[PDB]
């Protein structure tokens, strides 16, 4: 039914290692080369990745900005409203980024704002100019 275990033989393989006198050592050489061909190319990319790793030395620790835990607020200060309008011009619909910029507005308060001052801050125009980028 099936060859013993730890023993591998397919009809296809048999015909390949018999086609001529040395088809045997021909096929076993192609793999011998093919292995070295890959084995070398492993070290080649091990070298590449080794160098790229040393560029990334120091992590990004000289660039990390401390935590700003500030409580989400109900009120829209004129300042906060202006930050908003500008953030829209820069971020479009990304309510998450816009919420992050203002700092004390929930991702939904932002969406509310979008509808509340919709006409007064021509958010129509403001949004279509963001699209023009």
């Amino acid at each position: 039914r099936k060859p013993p275990k730890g023993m591998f033989l397919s009809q296809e393989d048999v015909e390949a290692v018999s086609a001529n006198a040395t088809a045997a050592t021909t096929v076993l050489r192609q793999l011998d080369m093919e292995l070295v061909s890959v084995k070398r190319q492993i070290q080649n990319i091990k070298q590449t990745n080794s160098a790229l790793k040393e560029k990334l030395d120091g992590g990004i620790e000289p660039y990390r900005l401390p935590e700003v835990i500030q409580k989400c607020n109900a009120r829209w200060t004129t300042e906060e409203q202006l930050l908003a309008v500008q953030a829209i011009r820069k971020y479009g619909r990304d309510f998450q980024a816009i919420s992050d910029v203002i700092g004390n507005k929930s991702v939904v308060q932002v969406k509310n704002f979008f509808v509340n001052y919709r006409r007064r801050f021509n958010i129509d125009e403001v949004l279509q100019e963001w699209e023009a980028e």
Partner: protein, 666 residues
């Protein structure tokens, strides 16, 4: 098995079914009713049992019916038809038994038997047992043929046959009861010892062997399941097949390695793409921080657009830091996944040179078992006789196997030193022309009704022929002689003055340095009470070693032994013998094997007797005149003493039927 059915088994017969030969002699019964068949079967089995239970005295028809019961002992013609058939075909009253009623007053028919090997002797006894005129013609100065026993002083060692390969249904089981035969078991535990002269660790010893057995099974799969049997018109040998399997195993090892390193490069090259992404991020992260820094330097109070810039860049920065953190997360996973794959590679090699050498010893051992290079054995058929193997321990004849042919030879017309040179057979009878081996010009002529030829295959193989057939043997028979393989394997008998080896071990191996030399002195037998070691030359080596003087051989022998037991533990052997079977004129080899391009069927062709053409044209179809027994004629037990024995019994039967007619088919 035991009881009545045990006897049937012990006689190589299905206890609950009529054989083809029974169907021939009892065409009524087998085509008859199931009830009848079963009565018959019991009778047969019972009679066999009786003979078996006590095989040192003849079992007569009267003595038989005596022990039968109702309903069985009612029909005494069936009981007679049975006891006769069994006696005819040597299933009962064969070998060395005591005759109740001394031989028939006068002899009927005359038979010349060529060679007094076991097949010869067995057949002779039977023919004379049936009251025929029998003379055997032996070229040698002794009986036995390929049953040679060296004897000098107290040293006794078989240069020929030496093992009884299981008593389970072995006709030799019977014989060994009839003759005083000291039979000793053989502990099949065999420690190996490399070229350096040190044991092979139980670790490897097993890992190699198991791999061996696997490789064999593989050839068998390759043969039956894939039908890999004809390559470039030539029949595939076991050798080629074993090579192909090994290569394909070596291939797999590489296929594995290739796709595993291929696994690594894909991951390594994934890690690369990620680092590139990471560098190009730390790049913007650097510059973006600068910009936020510059925007923070603009000291307040600042208008809103300049305040937005600070807030903006802040967001943007933490956003890009979010990514880099996650990409450093990914990095750590892919970076360990690479130590994962570099922790467990697939196997380095299929087999080392140390492995491949021990594997060769197993191959040599198999070459020893077939007395031939595995490159000659038929892939499909080499083992066809596997199923007929006897049950029980293999045994050694302690007092020398020769005691058997010698015991058979007692009371037989045997012309020793008589070399059959020509066999002429015609419609009216045969004459056999032999010469005296000593003074060769002294010529003998033998006239007979029938010639039974137990000439070794290697002999029937000779070219130019050692024996002429007049008229020539029909091409169908000669082809079968060409096709069949006749191998070789030699022994070195080393007789010392003391047991310097492990007495609890029967056999130990030595591992050769090459494939080419794998069978050279590859195995040693300690069997006897006496300090005798027996060393085997098998495979390709066997044929080559015959061209090497005994001293040189015994040299290589002591060498190996010293190398294993200590350079000062191994004395000089008091007596040595070296067999040369291929060289021997009356063997031209050791025993047969199924060569590639042959089959079990050829063995049948060997047994088929020869019927001469008619004398006067248009006269009736002649009787068969020329008959063949011998180890090479018995499909189901080739290359063995019992096989020979049985072939002899077989031919005797057939000849008796031919010339004494069938009294037992009415």
């Amino acid at each position: 098995p035991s009881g009545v059915e045990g006897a049937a088994f012990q006689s190589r017969l299905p206890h609950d079914r009529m054989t083809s030969q029974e169907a021939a002699c009892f065409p009524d019964i087998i085509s008859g009713p199931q009830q009848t068949q079963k009565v018959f079967l019991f009778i047969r089995n019972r009679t066999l049992q009786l003979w078996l239970d006590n095989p040192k005295i003849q079992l007569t028809f009267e003595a038989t019916l005596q022990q039968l019961e109702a309903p069985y002992n009612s029909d005494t013609v069936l009981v007679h038809r049975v006891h006769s058939y069994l006696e005819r075909h040597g299933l009962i009253n064969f070998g060395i038994y005591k005759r109740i009623k001394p031989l028939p007053t006068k002899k009927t028919g005359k038979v010349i038997i060529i060679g007094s090997g076991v097949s010869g002797l067995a057949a002779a006894r039977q023919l004379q047992s049936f009251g025929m005129d029998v003379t055997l013609l032996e070229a040698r100065d002794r009986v036995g043929g390929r049953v040679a026993t060296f004897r000098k002083g107290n040293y006794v060692a078989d240069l020929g046959a030496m093992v009884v390969t299981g008593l389970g249904g072995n006709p030799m089981a019977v014989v060994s009861k009839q003759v005083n035969m000291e039979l000793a078991k053989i502990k099949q535990k065999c420690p190996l010892y490399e070229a350096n002269g040190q044991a092979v660790p139980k670790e490897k010893d097993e890992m190699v062997e198991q791999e061996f057995n696997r490789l064999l099974e593989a050839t068998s799969y390759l043969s039956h399941q894939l039908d890999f049997n004809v390559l470039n018109n030539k029949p595939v040998s076991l050798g080629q097949a074993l090579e192909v399997v090994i290569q394909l195993q070596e291939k797999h090892v590489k296929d594995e390695q290739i796709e595993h390193w291929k696994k690594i490069v894909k991951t390594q090259e994934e890690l690369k793409e990620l680092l590139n992404k990471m560098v190009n991020l730390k790049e913007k992260i650097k510059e973006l921080h600068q910009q936020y820094k510059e925007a923070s330097e603009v000291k307040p109070p600042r208008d809103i657009t300049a305040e937005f810039l600070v807030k903006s860049k802040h967001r943007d920065l933490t956003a890009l830091c979010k990514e880099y953190d996650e990409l450093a997360e990914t990095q750590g996973k892919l970076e360990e996944k690479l130590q994962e794959l570099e922790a467990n590679p697939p196997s380095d090699v299929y087999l080392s040179s140390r492995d491949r050498q021990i594997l060769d010893w197993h191959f040599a051992n198999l070459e020893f078992a077939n007395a031939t290079p595995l490159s000659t054995l038929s892939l499909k058929h080499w083992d066809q006789d596997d199923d007929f193997e006897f049950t029980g321990s293999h045994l050694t004849v302690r007092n020398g196997y020769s005691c058997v042919p010698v015991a058979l030879a007692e009371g037989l017309d045997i012309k020793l030193n008589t070399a059959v040179r020509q066999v002429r057979y015609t419609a009216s009878g045969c004459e056999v022309i032999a010469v005296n081996t000593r003074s060769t010009s002294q010529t003998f002529i033998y006239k007979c009704d029938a010639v039974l030829c137990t000439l070794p295959l290697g002999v029937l193989k000779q070219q130019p022929p050692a024996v002429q057939f007049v008229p020539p043997l029909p091409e169908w028979k000669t082809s079968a002689v060409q096709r069949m393989g006749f191998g070789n394997l030699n022994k070195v008998v080393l007789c010392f003055d003391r047991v310097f080896w492990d007495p609890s071990v029967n056999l130990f191996g030595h591992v050769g340095s090459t494939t080419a030399s794998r069978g050279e002195l590859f195995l040693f037998w300690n069997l006897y009470k006496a300090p005798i070691l027996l060393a085997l030359v098998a495979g390709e080596a066997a044929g080559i070693m015959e061209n090497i003087s005994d001293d040189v051989i015994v040299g290589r022998c002591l060498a190996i032994l010293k190398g294993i037991f200590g350079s000062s533990a191994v004395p000089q052997p008091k007596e040595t013998v070296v067999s040369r079977w291929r060289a021997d004129p009356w063997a031209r080899g050791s025993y047969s094997y199924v060569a590639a391009g042959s089959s079990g069927n050829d063995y049948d062709l060997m047994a088929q007797p020869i019927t001469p053409g008619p004398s006067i044209p248009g006269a009736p179809q002649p009787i068969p005149r020329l008959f063949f027994a011998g180890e090479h004629t018995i499909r189901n037990y080739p290359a063995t003493v019992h096989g020979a024995l049985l072939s002899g019994l077989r031919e005797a039967g057939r000849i008796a039927d031919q010339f004494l007619g069938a009294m037992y088919t009415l």
